[PDB]
Design an enzyme around this catalytic site. Sequence first.
Site, short mmCIF file in Angstrom:
data_model
loop_
_atom_site.label_atom_id
_atom_site.label_comp_id
_atom_site.label_asym_id
_atom_site.label_seq_id
_atom_site.Cartn_x
_atom_site.Cartn_y
_atom_site.Cartn_z
N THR A 26 -20.70 72.45 20.40
CA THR A 26 -19.54 72.02 20.56
C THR A 26 -18.85 72.79 20.81
O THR A 26 -18.59 73.89 19.51
CB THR A 26 -19.47 70.57 19.67
OG1 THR A 26 -18.36 70.58 20.89
CG2 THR A 26 -18.98 70.89 18.43
N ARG A 27 -17.39 73.11 21.42
CA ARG A 27 -16.83 74.01 21.17
C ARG A 27 -15.48 73.12 21.62
O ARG A 27 -13.85 73.65 21.98
CB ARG A 27 -16.53 74.83 23.06
CG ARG A 27 -16.64 74.32 24.28
CD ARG A 27 -16.80 75.12 24.58
NE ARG A 27 -16.35 74.27 26.75
CZ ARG A 27 -16.08 73.12 26.67
NH1 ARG A 27 -17.45 73.06 26.85
NH2 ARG A 27 -16.10 73.37 28.22
N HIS A 62 -15.95 63.28 17.22
CA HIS A 62 -15.04 61.31 17.96
C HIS A 62 -16.10 60.75 17.24
O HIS A 62 -17.37 61.14 16.96
CB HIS A 62 -14.38 61.08 19.27
CG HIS A 62 -13.79 62.05 19.15
ND1 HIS A 62 -12.14 62.20 18.77
CD2 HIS A 62 -13.21 62.37 20.58
CE1 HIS A 62 -11.30 63.06 19.48
NE2 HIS A 62 -12.26 63.52 20.82
N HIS A 121 -19.75 60.93 19.33
CA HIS A 121 -20.42 62.39 19.05
C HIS A 121 -21.09 62.11 17.17
O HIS A 121 -22.10 62.54 17.65
CB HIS A 121 -19.32 63.52 18.76
CG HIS A 121 -18.00 63.97 19.70
ND1 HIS A 121 -19.19 64.33 20.70
CD2 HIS A 121 -17.18 63.49 19.94
CE1 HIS A 121 -18.24 63.80 21.70
NE2 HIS A 121 -17.09 63.43 21.64
N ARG A 157 -24.53 67.25 29.35
CA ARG A 157 -24.30 67.79 30.63
C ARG A 157 -23.77 68.51 31.40
O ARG A 157 -22.73 68.29 30.71
CB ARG A 157 -23.75 66.27 31.03
CG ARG A 157 -23.55 65.95 32.86
CD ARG A 157 -23.20 64.64 33.02
NE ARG A 157 -22.72 64.23 34.57
CZ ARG A 157 -22.17 64.91 35.13
NH1 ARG A 157 -21.21 65.99 34.57
NH2 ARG A 157 -21.64 64.49 36.45
#
EC number: 2.7.7.4
Length: 386
Positions: A195-196, A200, A203, A289
Amino acid sequence: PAPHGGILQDLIARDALKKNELLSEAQSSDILVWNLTPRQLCDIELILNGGFSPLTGFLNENDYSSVVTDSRLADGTLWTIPITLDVDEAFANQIKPDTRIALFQDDEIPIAILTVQDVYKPNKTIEAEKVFRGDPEHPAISYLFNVAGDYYVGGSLEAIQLPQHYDYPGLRKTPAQLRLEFQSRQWDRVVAFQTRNPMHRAHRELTVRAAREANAKVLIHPVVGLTKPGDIDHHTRVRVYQEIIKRYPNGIAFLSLLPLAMRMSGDREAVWHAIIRKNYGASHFIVGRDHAGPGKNSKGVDFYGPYDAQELVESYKHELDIEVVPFRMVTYLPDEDRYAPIDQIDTTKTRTLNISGTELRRRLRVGGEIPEWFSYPEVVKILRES
Ligand SMILES: [Co+2]
């Protein structure tokens, strides 16, 4: 699991006993010096710490050519993203095979010594087309033509020290350190999350679910180096990660930062990510995705198909010896006060609560309240008017 190529190319550990000798040489007045660019600093940290195993240096033209067209090093080892030392023409003119070059950080800190194998002028149009799909608006292509030097220097590296960081000490665990952390907890199965962006409630739920279904633990492995233009400030993101990990089930997750310079190269980058995470000790990797995708260009055309990344990594899974876990977004179901995968909810009579990225961005800018079903209060506070 075993590192990609079988050996963790932790050059810091390999050259530890000759650090004083290498440092002395790097500081000599007669050695050629190259001040590393920001992207090169990120790349070299991952080469030196084994994150880019089997790489032990910057790619020579033989390996580079194979990576560009066949997604493999010349010896056949899977490798999708070319990692090269790009320099300007004048500098390239002073180089010849066997020349030793001192690589510096901020023109003052000796990082490594490169023994040159070759110096060549890559055909950037072929690189842009084959590696990045050719769209001039692709971030990696704009970088390739506008920022990257027009000459590449292939060679093997000898380590002096990892690039120096002044933010979040000890948070950037090296592959060796993370591998030891996992072994120390008897974590033989670990699902890594790339992740970048901020994380929340959704996740937290999807990563926990991924771990439980695979009978594994969770590695939150956010990128802090070079991400996508316009991303949330790295300090805000790190604070978000430090806070949200406290909301995970007892002893199921671990947080570590990855100093990667993303190319936003979609499917090829997803394979590269799988390799990197395998080198860091992961057995499973979540592929999203449009994983590492730049999105759409000026004409609304996607740079990559939404499932291109998942499909490409899945196709190499056996060769990578890693398991692919499709990103399964979750939503909140008010009528049942629970979270469930959006996929789980077939086109039927099931209500869900969601907050779009657009709505979230706008509320945060006007001090609008954010529901707890969307994100933890402590996390929202960190993103609040950031
Ligand atoms: Co900072």
